CSV table of C-alpha atoms (C1' of nucleotides) and ligand atoms in Angstrom, one decimal:
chain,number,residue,atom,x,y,z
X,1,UNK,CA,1.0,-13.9,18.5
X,2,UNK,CA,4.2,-15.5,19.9
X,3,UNK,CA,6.2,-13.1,18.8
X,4,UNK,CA,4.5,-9.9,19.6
X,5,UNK,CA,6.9,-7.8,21.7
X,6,UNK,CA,9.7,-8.2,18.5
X,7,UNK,CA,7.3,-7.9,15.8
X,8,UNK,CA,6.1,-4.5,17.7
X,9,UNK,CA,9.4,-3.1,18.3
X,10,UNK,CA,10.4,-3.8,14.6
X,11,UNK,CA,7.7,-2.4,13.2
X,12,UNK,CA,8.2,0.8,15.3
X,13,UNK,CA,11.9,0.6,13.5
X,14,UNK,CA,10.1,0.3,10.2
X,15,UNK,CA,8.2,3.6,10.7
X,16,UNK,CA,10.7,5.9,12.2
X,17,UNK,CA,13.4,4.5,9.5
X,18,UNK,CA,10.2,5.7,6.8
X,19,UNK,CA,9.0,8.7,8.7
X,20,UNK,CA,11.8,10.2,10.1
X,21,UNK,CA,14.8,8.8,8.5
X,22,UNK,CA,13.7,8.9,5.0
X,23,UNK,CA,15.7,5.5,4.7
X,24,UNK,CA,13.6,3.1,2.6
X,25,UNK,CA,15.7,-0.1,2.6
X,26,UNK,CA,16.0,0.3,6.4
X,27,UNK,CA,12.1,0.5,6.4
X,28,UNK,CA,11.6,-2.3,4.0
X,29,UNK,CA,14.3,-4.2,6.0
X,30,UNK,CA,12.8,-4.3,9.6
X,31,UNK,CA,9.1,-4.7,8.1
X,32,UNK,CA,10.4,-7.8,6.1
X,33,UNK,CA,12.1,-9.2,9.3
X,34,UNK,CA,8.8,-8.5,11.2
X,35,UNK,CA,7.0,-10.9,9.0
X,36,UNK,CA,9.0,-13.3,8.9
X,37,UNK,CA,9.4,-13.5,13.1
X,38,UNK,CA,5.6,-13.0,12.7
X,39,UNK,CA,4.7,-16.4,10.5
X,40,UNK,CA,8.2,-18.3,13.0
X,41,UNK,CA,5.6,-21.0,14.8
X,42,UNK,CA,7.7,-20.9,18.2
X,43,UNK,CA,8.5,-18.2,21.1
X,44,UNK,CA,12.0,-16.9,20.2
X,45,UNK,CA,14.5,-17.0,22.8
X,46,UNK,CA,17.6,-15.5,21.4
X,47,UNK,CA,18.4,-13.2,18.7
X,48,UNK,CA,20.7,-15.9,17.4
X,49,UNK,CA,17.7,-18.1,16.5
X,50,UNK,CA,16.2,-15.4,15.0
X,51,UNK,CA,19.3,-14.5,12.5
X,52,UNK,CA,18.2,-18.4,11.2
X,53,UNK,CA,15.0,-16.6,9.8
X,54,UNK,CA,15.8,-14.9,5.8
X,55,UNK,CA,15.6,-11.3,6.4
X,56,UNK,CA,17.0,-11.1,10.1
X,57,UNK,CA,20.9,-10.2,10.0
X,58,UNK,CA,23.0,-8.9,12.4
X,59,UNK,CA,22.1,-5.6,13.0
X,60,UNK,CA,18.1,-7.1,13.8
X,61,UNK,CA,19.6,-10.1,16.2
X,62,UNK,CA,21.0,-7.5,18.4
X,63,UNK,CA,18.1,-5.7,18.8
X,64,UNK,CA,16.6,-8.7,19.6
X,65,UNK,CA,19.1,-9.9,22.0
X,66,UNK,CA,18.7,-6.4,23.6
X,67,UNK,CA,15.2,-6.7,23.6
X,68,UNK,CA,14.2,-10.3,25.3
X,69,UNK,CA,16.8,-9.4,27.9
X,70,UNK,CA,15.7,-6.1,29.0
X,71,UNK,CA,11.9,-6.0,27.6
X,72,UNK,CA,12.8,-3.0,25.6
X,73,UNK,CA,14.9,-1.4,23.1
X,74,UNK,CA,17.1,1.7,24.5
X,75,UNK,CA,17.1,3.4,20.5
X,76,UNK,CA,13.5,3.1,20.6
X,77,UNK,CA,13.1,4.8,24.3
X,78,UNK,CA,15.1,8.3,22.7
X,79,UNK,CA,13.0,8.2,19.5
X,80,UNK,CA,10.4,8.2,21.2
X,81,UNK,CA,11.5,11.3,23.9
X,82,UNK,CA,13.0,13.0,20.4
X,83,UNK,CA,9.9,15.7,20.0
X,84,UNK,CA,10.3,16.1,16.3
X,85,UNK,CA,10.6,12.6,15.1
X,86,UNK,CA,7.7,12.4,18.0
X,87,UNK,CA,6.0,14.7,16.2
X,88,UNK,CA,6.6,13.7,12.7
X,89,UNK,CA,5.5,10.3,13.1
X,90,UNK,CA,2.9,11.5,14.3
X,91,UNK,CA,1.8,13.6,11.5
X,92,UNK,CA,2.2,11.1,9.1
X,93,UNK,CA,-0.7,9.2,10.2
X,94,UNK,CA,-2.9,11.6,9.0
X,95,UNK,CA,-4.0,10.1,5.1
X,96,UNK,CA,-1.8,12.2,2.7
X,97,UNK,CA,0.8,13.6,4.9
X,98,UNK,CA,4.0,11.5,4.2
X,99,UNK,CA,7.7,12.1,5.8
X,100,UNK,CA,8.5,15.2,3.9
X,101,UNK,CA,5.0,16.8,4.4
X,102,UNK,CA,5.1,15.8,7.9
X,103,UNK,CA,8.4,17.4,8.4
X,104,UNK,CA,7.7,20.4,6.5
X,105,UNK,CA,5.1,21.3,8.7
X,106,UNK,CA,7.0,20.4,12.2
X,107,UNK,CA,9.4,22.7,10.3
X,108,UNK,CA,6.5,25.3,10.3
X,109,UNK,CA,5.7,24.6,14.0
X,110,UNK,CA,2.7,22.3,13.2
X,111,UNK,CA,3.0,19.6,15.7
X,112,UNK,CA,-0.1,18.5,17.0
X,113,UNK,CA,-3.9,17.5,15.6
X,114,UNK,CA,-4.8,21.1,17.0
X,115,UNK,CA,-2.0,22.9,14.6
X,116,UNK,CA,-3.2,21.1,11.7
X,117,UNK,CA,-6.8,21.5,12.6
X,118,UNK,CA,-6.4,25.8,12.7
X,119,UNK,CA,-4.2,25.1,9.7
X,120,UNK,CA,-6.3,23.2,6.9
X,121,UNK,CA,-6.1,26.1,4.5
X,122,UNK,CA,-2.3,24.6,4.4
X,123,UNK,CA,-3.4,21.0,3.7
X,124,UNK,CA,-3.8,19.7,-0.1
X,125,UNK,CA,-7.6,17.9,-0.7
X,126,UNK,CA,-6.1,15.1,0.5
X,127,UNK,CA,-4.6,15.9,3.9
X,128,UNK,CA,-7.8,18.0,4.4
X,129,UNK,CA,-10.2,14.7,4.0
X,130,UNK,CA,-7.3,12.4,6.2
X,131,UNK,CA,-7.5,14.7,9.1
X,132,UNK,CA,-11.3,14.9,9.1
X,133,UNK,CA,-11.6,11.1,9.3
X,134,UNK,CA,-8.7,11.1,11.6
X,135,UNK,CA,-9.8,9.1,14.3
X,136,UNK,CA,-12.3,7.2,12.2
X,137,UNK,CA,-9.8,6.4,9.9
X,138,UNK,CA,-8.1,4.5,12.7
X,139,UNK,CA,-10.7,2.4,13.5
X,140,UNK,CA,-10.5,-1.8,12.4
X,141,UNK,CA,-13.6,-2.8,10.3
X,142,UNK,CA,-15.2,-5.9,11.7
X,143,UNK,CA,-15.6,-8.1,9.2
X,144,UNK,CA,-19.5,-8.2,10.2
X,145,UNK,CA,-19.6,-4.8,8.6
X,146,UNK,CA,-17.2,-5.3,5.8
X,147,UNK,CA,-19.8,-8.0,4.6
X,148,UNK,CA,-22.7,-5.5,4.8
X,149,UNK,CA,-20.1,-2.8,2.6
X,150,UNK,CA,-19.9,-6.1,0.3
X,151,UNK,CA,-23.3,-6.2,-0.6
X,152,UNK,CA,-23.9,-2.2,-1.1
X,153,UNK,CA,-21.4,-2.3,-3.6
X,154,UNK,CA,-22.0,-5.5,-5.8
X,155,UNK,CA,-25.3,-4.4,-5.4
X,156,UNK,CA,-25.4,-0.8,-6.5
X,157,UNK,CA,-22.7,-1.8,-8.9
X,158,UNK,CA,-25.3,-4.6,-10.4
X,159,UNK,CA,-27.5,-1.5,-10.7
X,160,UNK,CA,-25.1,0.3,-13.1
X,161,UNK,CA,-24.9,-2.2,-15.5
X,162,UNK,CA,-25.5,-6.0,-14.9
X,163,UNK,CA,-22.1,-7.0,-16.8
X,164,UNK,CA,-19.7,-5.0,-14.3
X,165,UNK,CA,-18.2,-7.5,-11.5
X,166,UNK,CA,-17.1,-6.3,-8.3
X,167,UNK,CA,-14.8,-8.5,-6.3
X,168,UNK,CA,-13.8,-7.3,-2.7
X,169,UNK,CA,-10.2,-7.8,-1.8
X,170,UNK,CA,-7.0,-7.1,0.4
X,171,UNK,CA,-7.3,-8.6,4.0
X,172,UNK,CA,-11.2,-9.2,3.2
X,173,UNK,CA,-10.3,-11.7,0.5
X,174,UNK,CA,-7.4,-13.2,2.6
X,175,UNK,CA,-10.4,-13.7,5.2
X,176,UNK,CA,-9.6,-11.6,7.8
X,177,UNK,CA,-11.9,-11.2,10.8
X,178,UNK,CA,-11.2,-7.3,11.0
X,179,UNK,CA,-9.8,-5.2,7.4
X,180,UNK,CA,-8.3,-1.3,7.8
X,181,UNK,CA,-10.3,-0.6,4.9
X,182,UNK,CA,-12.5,-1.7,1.7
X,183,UNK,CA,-10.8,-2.6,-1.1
X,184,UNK,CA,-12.9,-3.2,-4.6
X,185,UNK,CA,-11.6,-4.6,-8.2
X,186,UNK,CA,-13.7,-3.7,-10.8
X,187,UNK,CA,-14.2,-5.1,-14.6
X,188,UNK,CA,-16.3,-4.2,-17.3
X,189,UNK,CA,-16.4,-6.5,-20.4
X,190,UNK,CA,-16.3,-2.7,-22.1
X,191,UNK,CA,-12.5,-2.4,-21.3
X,192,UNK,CA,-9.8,-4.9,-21.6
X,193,UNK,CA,-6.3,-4.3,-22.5
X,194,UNK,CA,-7.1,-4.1,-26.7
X,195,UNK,CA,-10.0,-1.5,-26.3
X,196,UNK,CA,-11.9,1.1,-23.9
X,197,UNK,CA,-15.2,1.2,-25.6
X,198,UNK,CA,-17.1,3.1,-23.5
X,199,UNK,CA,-15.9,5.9,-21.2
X,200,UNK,CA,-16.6,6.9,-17.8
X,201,UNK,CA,-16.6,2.9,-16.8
X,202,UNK,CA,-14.8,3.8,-13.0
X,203,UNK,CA,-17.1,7.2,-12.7
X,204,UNK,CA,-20.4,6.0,-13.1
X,205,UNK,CA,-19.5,3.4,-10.2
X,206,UNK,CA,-18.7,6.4,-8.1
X,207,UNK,CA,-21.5,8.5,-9.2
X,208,UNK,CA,-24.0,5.9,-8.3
X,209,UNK,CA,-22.4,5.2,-4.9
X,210,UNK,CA,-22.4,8.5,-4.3
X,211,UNK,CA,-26.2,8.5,-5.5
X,212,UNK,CA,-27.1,6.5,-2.4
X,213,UNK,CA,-24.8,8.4,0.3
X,214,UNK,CA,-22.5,5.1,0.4
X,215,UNK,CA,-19.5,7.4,-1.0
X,216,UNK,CA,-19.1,10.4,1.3
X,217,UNK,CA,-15.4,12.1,0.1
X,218,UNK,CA,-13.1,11.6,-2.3
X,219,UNK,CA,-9.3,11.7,-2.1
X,220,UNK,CA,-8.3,11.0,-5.4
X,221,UNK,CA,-9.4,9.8,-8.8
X,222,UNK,CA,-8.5,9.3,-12.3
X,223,UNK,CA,-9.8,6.7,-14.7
X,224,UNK,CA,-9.1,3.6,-13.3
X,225,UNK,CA,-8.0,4.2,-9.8
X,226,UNK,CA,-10.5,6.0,-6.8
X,227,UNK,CA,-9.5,6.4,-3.2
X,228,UNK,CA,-12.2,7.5,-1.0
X,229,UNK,CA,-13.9,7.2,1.7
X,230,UNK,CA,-17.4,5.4,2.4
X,231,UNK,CA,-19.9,5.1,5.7
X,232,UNK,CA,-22.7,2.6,6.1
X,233,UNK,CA,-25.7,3.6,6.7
X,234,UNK,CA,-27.2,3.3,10.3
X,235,UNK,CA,-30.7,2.5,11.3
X,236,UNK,CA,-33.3,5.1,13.3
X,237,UNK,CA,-31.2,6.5,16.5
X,238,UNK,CA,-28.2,4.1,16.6
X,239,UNK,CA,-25.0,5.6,16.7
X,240,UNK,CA,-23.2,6.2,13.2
X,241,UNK,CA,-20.9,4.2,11.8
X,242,UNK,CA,-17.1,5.2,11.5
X,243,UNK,CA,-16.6,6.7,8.2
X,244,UNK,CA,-14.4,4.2,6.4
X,245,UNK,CA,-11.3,4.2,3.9
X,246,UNK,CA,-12.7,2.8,0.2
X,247,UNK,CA,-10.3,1.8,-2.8
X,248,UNK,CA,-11.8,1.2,-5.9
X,249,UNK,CA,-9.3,-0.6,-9.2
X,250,UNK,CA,-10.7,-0.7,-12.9
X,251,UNK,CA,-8.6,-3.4,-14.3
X,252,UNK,CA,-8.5,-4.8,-18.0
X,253,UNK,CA,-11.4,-7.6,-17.8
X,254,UNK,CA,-8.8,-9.7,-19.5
X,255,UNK,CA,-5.8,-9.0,-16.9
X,256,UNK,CA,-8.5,-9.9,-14.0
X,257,UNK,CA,-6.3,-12.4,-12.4
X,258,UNK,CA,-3.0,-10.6,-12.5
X,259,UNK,CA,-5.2,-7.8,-10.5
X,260,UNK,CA,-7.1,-9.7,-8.4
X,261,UNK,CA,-3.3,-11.2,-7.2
X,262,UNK,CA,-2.1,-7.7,-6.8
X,263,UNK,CA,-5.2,-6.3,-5.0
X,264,UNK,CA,-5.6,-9.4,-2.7
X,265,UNK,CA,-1.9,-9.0,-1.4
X,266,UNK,CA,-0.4,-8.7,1.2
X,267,UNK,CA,1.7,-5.9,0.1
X,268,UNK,CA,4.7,-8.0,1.7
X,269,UNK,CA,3.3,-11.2,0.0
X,270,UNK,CA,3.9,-8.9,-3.3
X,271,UNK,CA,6.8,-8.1,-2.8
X,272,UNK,CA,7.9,-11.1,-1.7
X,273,UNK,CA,6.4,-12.5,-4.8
X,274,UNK,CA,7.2,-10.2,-7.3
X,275,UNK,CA,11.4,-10.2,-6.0
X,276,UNK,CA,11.0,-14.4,-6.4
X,277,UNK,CA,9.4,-13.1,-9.6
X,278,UNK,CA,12.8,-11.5,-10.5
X,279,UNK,CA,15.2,-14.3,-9.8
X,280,UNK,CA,12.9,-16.8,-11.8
X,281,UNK,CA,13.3,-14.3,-14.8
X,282,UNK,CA,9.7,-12.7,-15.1
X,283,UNK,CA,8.0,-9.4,-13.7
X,284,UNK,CA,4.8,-9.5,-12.7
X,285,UNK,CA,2.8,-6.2,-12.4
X,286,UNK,CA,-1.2,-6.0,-11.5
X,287,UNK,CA,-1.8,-6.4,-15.4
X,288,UNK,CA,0.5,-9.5,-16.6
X,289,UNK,CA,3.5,-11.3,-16.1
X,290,UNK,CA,6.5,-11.2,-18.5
X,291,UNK,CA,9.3,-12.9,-19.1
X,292,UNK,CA,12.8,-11.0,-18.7
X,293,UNK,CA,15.2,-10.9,-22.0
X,294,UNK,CA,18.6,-12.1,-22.0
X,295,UNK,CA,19.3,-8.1,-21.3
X,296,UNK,CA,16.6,-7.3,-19.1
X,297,UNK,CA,13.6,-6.0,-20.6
X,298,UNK,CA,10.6,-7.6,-20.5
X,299,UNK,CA,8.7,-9.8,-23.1
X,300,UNK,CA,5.3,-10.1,-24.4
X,301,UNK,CA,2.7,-11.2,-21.7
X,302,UNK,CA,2.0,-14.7,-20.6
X,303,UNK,CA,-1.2,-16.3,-21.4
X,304,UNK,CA,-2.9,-16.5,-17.6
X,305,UNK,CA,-6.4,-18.1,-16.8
X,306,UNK,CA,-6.3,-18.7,-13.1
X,307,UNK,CA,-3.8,-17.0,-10.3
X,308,UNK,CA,-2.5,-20.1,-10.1
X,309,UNK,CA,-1.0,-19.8,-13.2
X,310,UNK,CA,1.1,-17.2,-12.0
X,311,UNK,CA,2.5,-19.5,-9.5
X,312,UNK,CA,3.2,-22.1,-11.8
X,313,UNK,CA,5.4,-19.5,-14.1
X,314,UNK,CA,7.7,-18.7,-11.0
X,315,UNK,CA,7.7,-22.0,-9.8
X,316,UNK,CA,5.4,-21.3,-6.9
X,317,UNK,CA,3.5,-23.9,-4.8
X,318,UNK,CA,-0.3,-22.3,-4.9
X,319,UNK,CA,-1.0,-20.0,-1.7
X,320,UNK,CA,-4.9,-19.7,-0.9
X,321,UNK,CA,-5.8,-16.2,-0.1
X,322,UNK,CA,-5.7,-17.1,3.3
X,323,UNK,CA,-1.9,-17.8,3.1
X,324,UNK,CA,-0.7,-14.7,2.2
X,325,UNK,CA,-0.9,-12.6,4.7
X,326,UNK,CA,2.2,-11.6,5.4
J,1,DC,C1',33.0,-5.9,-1.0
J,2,DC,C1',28.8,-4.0,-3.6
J,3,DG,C1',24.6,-3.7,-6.2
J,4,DA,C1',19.8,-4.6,-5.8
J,5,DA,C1',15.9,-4.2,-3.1
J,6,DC,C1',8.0,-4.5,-6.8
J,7,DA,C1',5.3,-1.9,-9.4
J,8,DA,C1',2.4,1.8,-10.6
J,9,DG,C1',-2.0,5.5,-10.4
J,10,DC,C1',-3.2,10.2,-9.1
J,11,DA,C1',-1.9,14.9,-7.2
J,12,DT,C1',1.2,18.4,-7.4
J,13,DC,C1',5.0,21.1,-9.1
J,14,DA,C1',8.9,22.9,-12.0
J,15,DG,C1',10.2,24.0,-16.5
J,16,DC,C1',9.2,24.8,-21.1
F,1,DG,C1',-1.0,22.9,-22.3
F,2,DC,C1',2.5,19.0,-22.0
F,3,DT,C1',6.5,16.2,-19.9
F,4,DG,C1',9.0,14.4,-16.2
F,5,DA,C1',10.2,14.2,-11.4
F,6,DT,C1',8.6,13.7,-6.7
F,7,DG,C1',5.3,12.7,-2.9
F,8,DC,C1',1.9,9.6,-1.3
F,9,DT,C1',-0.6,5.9,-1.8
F,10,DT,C1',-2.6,0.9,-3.2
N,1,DT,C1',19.3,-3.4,6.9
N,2,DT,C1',19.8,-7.7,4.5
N,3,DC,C1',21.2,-10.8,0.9
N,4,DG,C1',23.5,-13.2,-3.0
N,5,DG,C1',27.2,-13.6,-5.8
C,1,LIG,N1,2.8,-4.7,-5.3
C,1,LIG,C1,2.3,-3.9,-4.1
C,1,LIG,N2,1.0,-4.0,-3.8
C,1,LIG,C2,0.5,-3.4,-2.7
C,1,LIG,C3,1.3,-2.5,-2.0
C,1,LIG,N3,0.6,-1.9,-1.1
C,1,LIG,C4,-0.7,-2.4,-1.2
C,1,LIG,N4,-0.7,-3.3,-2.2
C,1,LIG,C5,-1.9,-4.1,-2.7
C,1,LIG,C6,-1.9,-5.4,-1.8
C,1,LIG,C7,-2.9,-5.0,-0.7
C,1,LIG,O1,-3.5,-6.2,-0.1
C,1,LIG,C8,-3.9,-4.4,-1.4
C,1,LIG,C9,-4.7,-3.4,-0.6
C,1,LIG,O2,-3.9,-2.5,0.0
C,1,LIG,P1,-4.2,-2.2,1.6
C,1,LIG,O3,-3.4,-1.1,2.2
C,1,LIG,O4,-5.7,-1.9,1.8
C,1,LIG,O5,-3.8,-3.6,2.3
C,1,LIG,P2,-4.7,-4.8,2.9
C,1,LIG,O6,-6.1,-4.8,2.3
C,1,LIG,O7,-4.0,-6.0,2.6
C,1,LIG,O8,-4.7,-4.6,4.5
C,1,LIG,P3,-5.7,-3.7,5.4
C,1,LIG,O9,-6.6,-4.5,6.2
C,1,LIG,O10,-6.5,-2.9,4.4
C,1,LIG,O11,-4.9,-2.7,6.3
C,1,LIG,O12,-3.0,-3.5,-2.5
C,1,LIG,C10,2.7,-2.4,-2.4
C,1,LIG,O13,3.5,-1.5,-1.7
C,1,LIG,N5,3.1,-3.1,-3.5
C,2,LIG,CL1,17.7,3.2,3.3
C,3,LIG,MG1,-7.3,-3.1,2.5
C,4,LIG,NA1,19.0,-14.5,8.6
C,5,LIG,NA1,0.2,9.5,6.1
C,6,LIG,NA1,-7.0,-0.2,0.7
DNA sequence: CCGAACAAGCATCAGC
DNA sequence: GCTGATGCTT
DNA sequence: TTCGG
């Protein structure tokens, strides 16, 4: 990490601008410029050869400027003394409190992890499950124990029904050596994008991962999208495991490979991709990619057989898993 | 200067 | 109940 | 906050 005291204090940006300010461009602005310094392959000595870098403009060079001279960034050192954005970005770390919850309750005198603790009959589902993983939820997964989570899940999924196929991805897929969570795309030959013909396809996945105590919570699901949280199981008097963040995604079986792109990520790399997407005159989604009209509005869907194939449309060089990280 | 900035599922709420 | 907007999340 | 046009 060359870069590591910018791409910290822009990140730090990114969040208050999204926790406190409520200003979403300004989030999206200093995240994208964070990458970008992040992927620059040499030490950055001025915030002039930074502005070179797509993404850094003025305003960001400054800061820059401000910050390899001093160490530090003076707007930084008062948010951080400010007790309610303190305190609101604080809140929002807990899984389902956002910047208007979080604000809400600092508006209610709920500051700490104590106030919210003597205060979860205030808390949705949600915000109840979020700040009783808290700390766990903080926690990196080595990718040690991400592979033994891999092999629950195909497993128990096999279990199911043989023609279901489980594919692990986000930072697992782009091969990270440590993931924040699990995240699982899911066919069935059963549902595609002409037909569901049989229901319950995403449930009985849950269900049976429940069976076996891998599931321990849930924080939300519908039919093709569950968000909840899983633990591995331990052997006779070790320690627990850190409960652990799980995503599940039912896609079409024939939109696999616009949903394995989507669900490999990085969410930047979508973005990124998806904008590109935009100039070149398609939009891709996690279920197909279309060409845009002479008006706007999209088109039938693309025949796609590979990722690949997605690159090709938008006149993309192929990026392994690996190189998308961003 | 100024408009666009990725795309969408689930939970929750207001209004009907 | 349903529809649409908003929050929060991937 | 940044960029393209
Ligand atoms: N198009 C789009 N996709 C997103 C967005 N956020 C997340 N995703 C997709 C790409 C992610 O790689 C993938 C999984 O979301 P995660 O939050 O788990 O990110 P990821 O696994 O990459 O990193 P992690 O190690 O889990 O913190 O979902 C987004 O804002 N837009
Ligand atoms: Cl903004
Ligand atoms: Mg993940
Ligand atoms: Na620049
Ligand atoms: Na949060
Ligand atoms: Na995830």
């Amino acid at each position: 990490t060359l870069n590591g005291g910018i791409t910290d204090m822009l990140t730090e940006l990114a969040n208050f601008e999204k926790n406190v300010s409520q200003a979403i461009h300004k989030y999206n602005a200093y995240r994208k410029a964070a990458s970008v310094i992040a992927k620059y392959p040499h030490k950055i000595k001025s915030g002039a050869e930074a502005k070179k870098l797509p993404g850094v403009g003025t305003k960001i060079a400054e800061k820059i400027d401000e910050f390899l001279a001093t160490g530090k960034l003076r707007k930084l050192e008062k948010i951080r003394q400010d007790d309610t954005s303190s305190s609101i970005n604080f809140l929002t770390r807990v899984s389902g409190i956002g910047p208007s919850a979080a604000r809400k309750f600092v508006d209610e005198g709920i500051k700490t992890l104590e106030d919210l603790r003597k205060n979860e009959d205030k808390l949705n589902h949600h915000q109840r499950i979020g700040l009783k993983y808290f700390g766990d939820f903080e926690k990196r997964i080595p990718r040690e124990e991400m592979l033994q989570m891999q092999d629950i899940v195909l497993n128990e999924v096999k279990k199911v029904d043989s023609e279901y196929i489980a594919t692990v991805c986000g930072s697992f897929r782009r091969g990270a050596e440590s993931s924040g969570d699990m995240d699982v795309l899911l066919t069935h030959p059963s549902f595609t994008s002409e037909s569901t013909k049989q229901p319950k396809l995403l449930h009985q996945v849950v269900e049976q991962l429940q069976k076996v105590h891998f599931i321990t919570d849930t924080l939300s699901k519908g039919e093709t999208k569950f968000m909840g949280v899983c633990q591995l199981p331990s052997k006779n008097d070790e320690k627990e495991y850190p409960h652990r963040r799980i995503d599940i995604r039912l896609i079409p079986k024939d939109q696999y490979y616009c949903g394995v792109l989507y669900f490999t990520g990085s969410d930047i790399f979508n973005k990124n991709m998806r904008a590109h997407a935009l100039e070149m005159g398609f939009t891709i989604n996690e279920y197909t990619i279309r060409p845009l009209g002479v008006t706007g509005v999209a088109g039938e869907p693309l025949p796609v057989d590979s990722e690949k194939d997605i690159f090709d449309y938008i006149q993309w060089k192929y990026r392994e898993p690996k190189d998308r990280s961003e």
